[PDB]
């Protein structure tokens, strides 16, 4: 939102919880798809050789 | 000097503890996540430094 602006950041300091929601939701989605990629592939633990 | 800080308060209106997120990466994490207790993990941080 703010291009390293002091006044813009000073006004966003009244919307801290909004960006806390956004960062937490996107981090949870990223961790969720790391879990998805782990669950679809990593089912067997012993990596058998060719 | 001009500094961004995070201040907590109790039920009595007294200041419990301060962060001063211009000195430490953990302080910047505390100002970013809007909390004083942070769970274990990796978190992107803002530009308070």
């Amino acid at each position: 939102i703010c291009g390293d602006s002091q006044e813009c950041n000073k006004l966003l300091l009244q919307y801290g919880s909004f960006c806390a929601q956004l960062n937490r939701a996107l981090s949870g989605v990223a961790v969720e798809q790391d879990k998805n990629t782990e669950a679809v592939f990593a089912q067997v633990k012993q990596i058998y050789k060719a | 000097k001009l500094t961004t800080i995070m201040l907590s308060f109790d039920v009595n209106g007294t200041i419990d503890k301060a962060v001063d997120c211009s000195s430490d990466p953990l302080s910047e994490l505390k100002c970013t996540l809007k909390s004083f207790n942070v769970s274990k993990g990796i978190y992107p941080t803002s530009n308070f430094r």
């Binding site: 300091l13 | 961004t4 201040l7 907590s8 209106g13």
Partner: peptide, 27 residues
């Protein structure tokens, strides 16, 4: 005439208004 360290000894009340049970940011 030497230096010491500000070991968290500069925290004051920024605003005159009353707040309780919150964690708020300041500049």
């Amino acid at each position: 005439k030497q230096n010491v360290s500000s070991l968290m000894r500069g925290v004051y009340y920024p605003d005159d208004i009353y707040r309780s049970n919150v964690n708020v940011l300041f500049t």
